[PDB]
Subunit: 393 residues, 4 copies
């Protein structure tokens, strides 16, 4: 295991709906809210920060190296280096494990990690404006599809990759809608019971102060879902009611060496034990969590049943159900407060977001299980990434 | 310092000029050429590759997670994961150190690292086409400037940060042009004497085979540079003649553990010793190599004089002269075959590119210096990154 | 004056607001509605139609020669020719006089005239996409401003030409708002009392049937207008409240020789007597009706006092008040049911639209004035055009 | 016949190739060259001008009412009114007959008529930038096709309408290429013999002075043409060698009443006798000249064989051959100096251009035929327009 890496804080913005409450807010701006919050919760002096690593997928028109922009505007000294990564939906979680690597090697004693995404403000592009089209029409490309949600390999939406999982693996419409229903009910109940209150950092729009995850649909019913029309294929199983949302949010965590945390008198929340990534066939990219988790299990000597709580992102109900079946997930310990379907899925953010939700869930009074947590998600182009943690108490 | 990381191969495409010989080729296409070449030169079985990490800055419209596209189309199994990283001009060098970190930690035994950029095919963006402009003009933004060459913090060009270095630190027009002149002459001579022949991997365009760096200008004279008008400020010192080019290329290296290389019968070319990044004031971003190298020296106990050869990227002569002065570079051992001014500067590629040139330079018959190599470059937003190598012989 | 030209029918669509009830409908679609209605009201056999002339300003992206599209989709034989005409806000009125000229000369016995505009669907233009921008930002131009509402000569808005009239000729903010207020009240009352019912041709949207002018604001008060901020200049007088609307509509009339009407058994509604256009200084374009009407008076021997009703388009209250003062209008006989401020101003349509409103107004039971009608409007680039009619009874 | 209308002067710019010699010159700017020249050749005092009427097809991004822009910048007083028309390729010739109508009715004693077109600078548009695309791609529309060269009715290029003429009417490839060959040879010989010298007005590009029609191909051969690949349909007959060019030019004529010309001591060049337009099936829009000419013949009592010279625009060789066959054209009197194929076809200009070429041809010493001239062209959407003249001597 990594032996020297702890999480000392975490924070996420509310999750906005597509063209919703954060439509007038950049990914950088959401990123700043989250990082400022993470720094304050850790009580880390900003001159102890060694690096900032942020996932961000849809970067067109956002300006230079968005991680660096966020850092400079969260009160982090200009002397601290920063870079941005893209592993699509894996981005925010691979940012965390890259940061953990920095600390475990002794290249850093404190790293800010996270992810951000404003899918609302992914722009449109034209490919041939530099040297000209000469004659004939061109395409006005939605970068959220071109550079995000469309499989570059196959030329179809991620939602078709979900239908592939449905076809090949026999995940029925009823199963998908059941998963979707449970996710909404869980998210609604969690919200109403204050389960998200502490982890959320409010976003002030200069004024309106946004505190609530706006994508949850508490009025969701099994019958309502069954009426919906397929979204990606005619006579399909995947709908808008059982696919993840398109959303806007950011999320950040402060990582530290054990020795640095001790020196600053900062209480460690959790250790990071290890991480893994793995590739799969792009056409069934939803399966990525399965080899990613297996690899993580071989590196750590853990098994699925050892985890007290598990976050496996719901990109599509077809995907989430298949992953949970094959890994032998306990659904009473997996995605307990909803996930991508209910809360939403801002793609560069979600990897750090699910780790943040896991951490706060496991930190709650009365959690006296194994104290191990697992986070994993699927990734367009056919990948998965995962991280194991153990709470410190 | 790192004890277990070796470079076993390196390759780069030739470097195209802006809107030049690679205008019809994508970043991803160049990446594939470089990665295939690196793999062939290593003789590494593709099922021994653990991860791919590629730097790439101007990603708008290029499709999903371009490192993954490159891997899949270079014959690497779908099971291998990949991610893309943006540290502007640092990207390709930071990709190398991130990959080294994988191996040093034992998370991987073989990683593909590098970078790629097609500045020619960076698209134009429309910011408010999703929810509408309503009334009134918008901006058609050139992503190469918005997301690349314009300082998001100051809102002026990288060239103006070059002027700032000239203002504050008194690097004169004449000094800038001498540097530029020597760069052009060094590159011309190197290209004529065959110095780049082995490192270059030819690009086939469907048939034309491209084998040569396009951007070098052997006709350059001190008297010609002196007549050029300032490109960034009225009555300025920075000109198209003493500024790096805008360019297209890709570059890749194969890294391995010493153990895996020994297992496979593959001979190491160089050890990676260590790395360092650092931040500076965005307005004088060109100063970034100075703290990055000092931090690297502090981590390794090396000094500038210990290097046999040095690659410090010439983003602008003003910047390069200042860094070399401040670091006490021996110009007979620094940038001996030219650099960004002459060879060109495809921003996401250059960090790996300079390391490949350094490696092949030090590997020439007749070299018998320290066998230590230094690569560093400056970064928009005020950063530097650096790597130290030692040839294996 | 003309001795052989009669109007036998007229129809207009309701007038939509900007991005309003007709946002999903093309100019051509509205044109078809109006032309079909006009043809049905005339009872003219379509094989008796000799030509179609339609005004239309913002034609970008609408396809080929839109008058011809309208004719073909209104059931007019392919054998009938058509052309489109642009005199900005004059277009639809100049279309009428051009058609009258056909008949007076004996080149035609029956012509379809009118105008159409969908300011909502005027597109955005990219100027250098054919041969390339090469490097550097461009402009995404709103064609409604570029090709419509911005003075190409001065490079400022039509609203600023309105300010110029206020500066030079001292039409005060209070005067502007009184005009605007009376316009809104006149239109509200007219619409409520059924005045527009017969002239309007309903628009079916595939089902929604649209029958009502959208833009009127019956809640307008002198006190409300007085609180509005200037829309075109800092510390100006012209506001969104005392300025014409941006709007969508179409309007058509059927013109015939007296001989053909008598042959077909079709009863004439009005004679067209004559027409006139004139130019003025672009910077005070709102003054255009003054020389156009004087030239018309000179050609006809009529005077302002001889008209029973007058339509002088309210492009801006500043402009309308100045014209009415200079021409000695009787405001109890001028714009009696509102005009551009209240009903709205779809620029290529309005010239025909005001003539249709004038015609139906004078045709009301109980009218027993001179039976002479005057229509005129101002034109960007510094023009006016006018038509005089006399009802047949 | 019209009895009171004469042409007192004419002028045209050279005709530029697509993205050629006038690529950096607007339609307005070419228009100004032509109008200034026409005014000077007439020696008409500018305060005797009553109206300006200019054809112009592709008006996107050109600014307000381009006829008015041209007038103001050709030294015509601001008091003179102007409008722009669009009848696609008919535009420039219908402008002439509309102007003649103004004079014959006694509404004007002097009118400037013409046409202009910069097909090079027709821009690209996006249809849904005002209210947004929300999600998914859009189209970047080439307005030269959308609003120009594509049949809006059928959704295919004008070149397909030419293939329709070829299919239905049996105009072979060999016939088309023969027509094309003859057109090039005629144009080359005419140019080389100075036949275009007087009519051309030189265009100074601020410096290079352009005097030559640049589209002519004197190296054209029957064999060369036979090698060319179809341009519009697979296994088609229509090629780039036998279709009109895409081009840039302008052209203007001064018209006057007989009485006004006498008063000013301006010698009339030709009388305009009459005009006609007619519609046809859009799919065979090339046939438009046939009914247009027939109608003109019935109005005038002229027959085809009465014309000393004839201009029938070559939009496509298939079109021109069919029109000439059906009208019984003498090819030794028809298109004697080439036409659309050789000289080019700037669409809003060509209608006035062919009348200008006709007028100068008939004015040459040694032309002592009937003194009657005919001009006619086809029009997308299925129309034709024609004008008859008689030289005065
Ligand atoms: C599926 C998708 C295309 C739908 O997007 P959308 O149409 O913008 O979605 P909306 O939230 O507006 O919902 C669409 C409709 O579905 C219905 N709907 C959605 N969720 C529902 C629910 N829980 N119950 C009932 N109806 C529901 C609604 O009727 C809604 O229309 P309405 O609210 O205007 O009446 C989009 O969410 C998507 O692509 N998701 C996947 C994202 C993804 O691939 N991420 C990466 C994965 S690795
Ligand atoms: C400086 C810059 C704007 C020049 O762009 P450009 O104008 O397209 O450059 P070109 O190579 O076409 O040079 C323009 C002219 O300069 C002249 N020129 C350039 N190098 C010359 C040399 N060595 N000798 C003589 N003249 C030279 C030429 O006249 C050339 O015109 P040409 O086409 O007739 O040869 C651009 O190179 C730039 O922005 N560079 C910096 C990139 C950067 O910031 N990277 C990131 C660093 S962190
Ligand atoms: C003036 C102009 C810029 C206003 O455009 P806009 O801002 O889209 O106009 P809106 O109708 O949305 O008005 C903006 C605000 O003004 C206020 N307003 C407008 N008319 C009002 C009235 N009668 N009473 C009170 N408030 C009024 C409202 O607050 C409105 O906001 P809302 O949406 O909450 O009602 C535009 O109408 C214009 O350019 N007009 C002139 C067109 C022209 O030049 N034509 C050619 C003439 S030759
Ligand atoms: C047919 C059309 C699409 C071709 O446009 P284009 O490809 O840009 O044309 P070019 O002038 O570049 O010629 C294309 C190729 O044809 C060949 N060519 C053209 N004319 C030739 C000739 N006379 N002899 C030999 N080769 C010829 C050339 O090889 C040329 O390629 P190259 O010169 O680079 O070797 C275009 O001219 C067109 O659409 N014309 C019709 C316009 C129209 O419809 N107007 C309205 C009518 S109502």
């Amino acid at each position: 295991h990594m032996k020297n890496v702890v999480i000392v804080s975490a924070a996420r913005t509310p999750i906005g709906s597509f063209n919703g409450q954060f439509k007038d807010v950049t990914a950088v701006q959401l990123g700043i809210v989250a990082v400022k919050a993470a720094i304050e919760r850790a009580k880390v002096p900003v001159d102890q920060i060694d690096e900032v690593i942020m996932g961000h997928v849809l970067t067109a028109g956002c300006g230079e190296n968005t991680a660096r922009q966020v850092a400079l505007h969260s009160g982090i000294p200009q002397e601290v280096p920063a870079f941005t990564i893209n592993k699509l939906s894996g981005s925010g979680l691979r940012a965390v494990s890259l940061g953990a690597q920095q600390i475990e090697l002794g290249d850093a004693d404190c790293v800010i990690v996270g992810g951000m995404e404003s899918m609302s403000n992914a722009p449109y592009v034209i490919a041939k404006a530099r040297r000209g089209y000469r004659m004939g029409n061109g395409v006005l490309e939605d970068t959220m599809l071109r550079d995000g949600l469309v499989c570059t390999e196959n030329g179809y939406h991620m939602g078709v990759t979900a239908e592939n999982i449905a076809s090949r693996f026999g995940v029925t419409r009823q199963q998908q809608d059941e998963c979707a229903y449970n996710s909404q009910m869980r998210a609604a109940k969690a919200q109403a019971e204050g389960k998200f209150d502490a982890q959320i950092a409010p976003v002030t729009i200069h004024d309106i102060v946004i505190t609530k995850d706006e994508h949850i649909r508490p009025e969701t019913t099994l019958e309502g879902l069954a009426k919906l029309k397929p979204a990606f294929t005619k006579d399909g199983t995947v709908t808008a009611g059982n696919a993840s949302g398109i959303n806007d949010a950011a999320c950040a965590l402060v990582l530290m060496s054990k020795k640095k945390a001790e020196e600053l008198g900062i209480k460690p929340i959790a250790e990071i034990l290890d991480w893994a990534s793995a590739g799969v066939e792009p056409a069934i990219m939803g399966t990525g969590p399965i080899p990613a988790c297996h690899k993580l299990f071989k590196k750590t000597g853990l098994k699925m049943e050892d985890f007290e709580l598990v976050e496996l992102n719901e990109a599509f109900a077809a995907q989430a159900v298949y992953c949970c079946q094959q890994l032998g997930a306990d659904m009473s310990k997996t995605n307990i407060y909803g996930s991508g379907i209910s809360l939403g899925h801002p793609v560069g953010c979600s990897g750090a977001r699910i780790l943040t939700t896991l951490l706060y869930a496991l930190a709650e009074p009365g959690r006296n299980g194994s104290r191990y947590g697992l986070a994993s998600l699927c990734i367009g182009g056919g990948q998965g990434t995962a991280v194991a943690i153990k709470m410190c108490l």
